[PDB]
Amino acid sequence: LADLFPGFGSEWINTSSGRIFARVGGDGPPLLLLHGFPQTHVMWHRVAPKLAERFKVIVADLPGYGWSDMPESDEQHTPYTKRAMAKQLIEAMEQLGHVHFALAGHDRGARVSYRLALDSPGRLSKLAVLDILPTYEYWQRMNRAYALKIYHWSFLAQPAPLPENLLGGDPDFYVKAKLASWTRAGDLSAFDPRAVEHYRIAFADPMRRHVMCEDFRAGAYADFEHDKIDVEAGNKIPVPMLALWGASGIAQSAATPLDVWRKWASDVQGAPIESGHFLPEEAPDQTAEALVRFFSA
Amino acid sequence: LADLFPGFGSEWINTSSGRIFARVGGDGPPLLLLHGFPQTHVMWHRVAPKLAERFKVIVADLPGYGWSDMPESDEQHTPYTKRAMAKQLIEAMEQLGHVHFALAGHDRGARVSYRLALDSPGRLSKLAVLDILPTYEYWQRMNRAYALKIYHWSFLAQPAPLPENLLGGDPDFYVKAKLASWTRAGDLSAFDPRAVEHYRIAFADPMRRHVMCEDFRAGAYADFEHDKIDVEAGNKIPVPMLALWGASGIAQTPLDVWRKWASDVQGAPIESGHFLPEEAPDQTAEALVRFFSA
DSSP, X not given: OOOOSTTOEEEEEOOTTOOEEEEEEEOSSEEEEEOOTTOOGGGGTTTHHHHHTTSEEEEEOOTTSTTSOOOOOOTTOGGGSHHHHHHHHHHHHHHTTOSSEEEEEETHHHHHHHHHHHHOGGGEEEEEEESOOOHHHHHXXXXXXXXXXXXHHHHTTSOTTHHHHHHTSOHHHHHHHHHHHTSSSSSSTTSOHHHHHHHHHHHTSHHHHHHHHHHHHHHHTHHHHHHHHHHHHTOOBOSOEEEEEXXXXXXXXXXXXXXXXXXXXXXXXXXXXXXXXXXXXXXXXXXXXXXXXXXXX | OOOOSTTOEEEEEOOTTOOEEEXXXXXXXXXXXXXXXXXXXXXXXXXXXXXXXTSEEEEEOOTTSTTSOOOOOOTTOGGGSHHHHHHXXXXXXXXXXXXXXXXXXXXXXXXXXXXXXXXXXXXXXXXXXXXXXXXXXXXXXXXXXXXXXXXXXHHTXXXXXXXXXXXXXXXXXXXXXXXXHTSSSXXXXXXXXXXXXXXXXXXXXXXXXXXXXXXXXXXXTXXXXXXXXXXXXXXXXXXXXXXXXXXXXXXXXXXXXXHTTXXXXXXXXXXXXXXXXXXXXXXHHHHHHHHHHO
């Protein structure tokens, strides 16, 4: 597997929930980057160099993803809830001496990030979320059109072992079909082939695939309930926030994303980028510039 | 494969879209029975004898299912739309000289049946639908809870080859898990093992699975649009109608829904999961005999 982060170190960070793998580079204010599904930390490889010119960059695998340890799940999918993942990554950052840091997340990692901001806002100087709306908003918007568009939210959340057994026959085809499907072009041309191989090797492990399904089970149940409590209480994220989304990504599908985030956050700016879902790989120059600009002064 | 219809004949009925397989038994007024997903005509094996005491019973494999021929699909999934399936089954019944008959359907076959009643009500003396609401109603109800409960309506409707590819690895597991998960018991104990083997053998064929996906693609697209026209026009089924549903089933307030779609409908729950004719054959048969007898 290729080293896609020239000059970055590698840490396996201990936490009570298991080790977090991360690439670490740069110098300056600390910035944590969190990937999503069906990816790993390597999705940041096209923007991490520019960010490392200005920040100490920590590029972490989510709990249970990539090279991070895989805690055993439970009947409530607890370790793969965004609340639990956020607690685990807070512990991981504390091992590095970071108790107040900047955070950018994409896809599932962006759900960890806004959940972190809701539960522990004092941990974050600034927050960026890439190509998402809150989990509560995706579910509240489910109707026939969106059930067809994001079918995988309901498919991968079916009780085990149904998705695991369907994914086991030809895992390469599914992970590559999802990667292609959510790009603007509908193929794999936006990805570095070495990055695709990282994603494919991770997805080829049945234990890794089970974690992904637990993530989506949490997304259908506890994560939704945690969000529901906040929205029904009127709780807003106070951390200065940036919402970026792809003009051809998932979040915009049937929702105007900045209006949605303004319901959830009291100091939020947002912009579209010409891109499908995978902003840091499909639009690395625009994504890196937006993030550098936001996190700087 | 076991013969689960003692005394019934076996017939391949010609139509302009391909052959319809059916088991045929009994004498009296004609009654067509239509199965659904992921089953074949054999799901009627526990109630067909009692019906054949009073009716000529025709137990047909849906277009593309079981032993029926598989017409070539197209970009709009036309032959697996319920409108097209109903036309094809109307042709098959004409080959037998039945132009006015009783009809009972379950699951996909009940969707064929109510669409047949809307398009061609003169064909039907009486209609029974088992453990369904109209396809439009399912989709209008498609919130988080329902997207999780009937996920396969969106999964199997994904563009080819996504579900076809996933189903090929372990088809026996998928068909068995569907059969079990929709019953009251949650396992396969309500089914005759010989019936399960019929369903497994059909589902083992990739061409048969592709048909099923085309059926759910039609269900997400053309079938929904056809139903939407009738709702938007205020069109109701005039055929006297029975809606039966499982107290633990999928359709679960169903008589209230059907009264919006039908001007003469009665209904009742059966203590059963989705698969009424196999989980509760005695109550299902009694309800059907009483309804169709008049």
